[PDB]
Amino acid sequence: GSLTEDGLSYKEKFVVRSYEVGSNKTATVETIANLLQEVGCNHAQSVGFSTATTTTMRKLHLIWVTARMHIEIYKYPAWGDVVEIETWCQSEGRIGTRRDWILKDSVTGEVTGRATSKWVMMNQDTRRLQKVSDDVRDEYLVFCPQEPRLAFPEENNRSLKKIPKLEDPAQYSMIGLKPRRADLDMNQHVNNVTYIGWVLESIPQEIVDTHELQVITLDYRRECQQDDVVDSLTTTTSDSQFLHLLRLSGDGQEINRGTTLWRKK
Amino acid sequence: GSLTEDGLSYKEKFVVRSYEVGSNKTATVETIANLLQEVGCNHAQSVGFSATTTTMRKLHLIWVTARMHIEIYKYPAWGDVVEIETWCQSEGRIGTRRDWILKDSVTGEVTGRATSKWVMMNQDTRRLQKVSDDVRDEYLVFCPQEPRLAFPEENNRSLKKIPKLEDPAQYSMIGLKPRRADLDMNQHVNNVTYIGWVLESIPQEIVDTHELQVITLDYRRECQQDDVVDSLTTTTSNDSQFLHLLRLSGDGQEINRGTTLWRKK
Ligand SMILES: NC(=O)c1cccc2[nH]ccc12
Ligand SMILES: NC(=O)c1cccc2[nH]ccc12
Helix, strand or coil: CEECCCCCCEEEEEECCHHHECCCCEECHHHHHHHHHHHHHHHHHHCCCCCCCCHHHHHHCEEEEEEEEEEEECCCCECCCEEEEEEEEEEECCCEEEEEEEEEECCCCCEEEEEEEEEEEEECCCCCECCCCHHHHHHHHHHCCCCCCCCCCCCCCHHHCCCCCCCCCCCEEEEEECCCHHHECCCCCECHHHHHHHHHCCCCHHHHHHEEEEEEEEEECCCCCCCCCEEEEEEECCCEEEEEEEEECCCCCEEEEEEEEEEEC | CEECCCCCCEEEEEECCHHHECCCCEECHHHHHHHHHHHHHHHHHHCCCCCCCHHHHHCCEEEEEEEEEEEECCCCECCCEEEEEEEEEECCCCCEEEEEEEEECCCCCEEEEEEEEEEEEECCCCCEECCCHHHHHHHHHHCCCCCCCCCCCCCCHHHCCCCCCCCCCCEEEEEECCCHHHECCCCCECHHHHHHHHHCCCCHHHHHHEEEEEEEEEECCCCCCCCCEEEEEEECCCCEEEEEEEEECCCCCEEEEEEEEEEEC
């Protein structure tokens, strides 16, 4: 992969692996989300970030936390196909940063998907959110385009829609979900993609067999720790549309909420 | 990737991804095992398979893994390129064997080696059978005629018989269940998932002070999508050695047994 000519975005190509595809022999949405995070890490590495915080974030013990992921897929890449992903970052005042991605077919150059993510700043020890510092923002404004470049430019698009809280009784549920070592990142935290897989565990088999996942929006509220247990709840709100809630198995503390949209095959 | 000059083996290079590494910022053994299966799949694709022969598909016959043995000297770091060469060899009517050699792309030094034993099974009845003459003759043209073993040693660890763990186990991880991410494109649990499940019962203290050097896993029965697994581990020993048993919750039907060897960091 490499930074583009103007140094303000990054591109990388991936060959879809055999173990990265589902029953329809095209890449799963968890494989897509892993590729989004991988090209995001290579972008930060290419501009000098920690091997992904700045000089001042490191001394203040500040980190980036994902607040929201929104993915829209038109065509999932087949096993053996090459998918090219371009990513870039943009600041959003003191509220946080945004990282967008565009997925393309390498042969046709056609856009097969797009994604947007909202990141917030948090003290790694206290887990307290704190907006963005005056001279912390100055350290990374040089690696972001100055004019707005949005993957979802539409006014009032699906990526910014507020998600309600699912009320019991849920229509479908998958309970007692627990992470294993494969689910941890290099910092021993549960990987953000694991939450996507957990949301989708409560989608009935019949839906997965007759429909294709087109849109997923996931809010991140609290992390599931290595010794926590998760319940995945899903209710139909309708194409097929669903409301989702991940909560810790005991007290019922919310960790995530989201919606999915599905097209009939 | 590509077949080598003589067409009797296959080589492929992989850049280690950010989400593929553990706390030591080097690739996990599950990432290694996924790469072994990926280069295995590209080798079969390059020789005309899709991965059974013309007679196997007609007779509803498939390849099933009976044993995996991996030995790692140095795990590839995040961002490093690892080159893997793989080949197959027939072992008479018992079945076939696929071996792999892992190398550092920059230094050319061997950083690991693996061997696997495969058997033939009727996909519907789940009944094992010896390889027939007409099925064997179909793939003998893609295997070297002289023996080429990743583990040539007089009495190497790859062929050692593994005993059955007796209760009470020293360590256990109970109620392990697969999710959709764990399934392959045929809706069967991925062979690498069993490795992760064996390692769930290794105490945290071991993982922090030791490095996994050797893993041998026998495969006996599959865990189905609605099955629940218990992972049991007992110390059998500078080095640390363990005996492992995976069994279904309830009746306690064995699905796997194995051993691991660990060196102090
Ligand atoms: N990945 C990051 O930490 C990041 C944050 C803000 C702007 C950026 N531009 C390239 C990478 C990056
Ligand atoms: N992977 C396979 O299906 C296979 C089986 C037997 C011999 C082989 N030689 C290359 C690939 C291969």
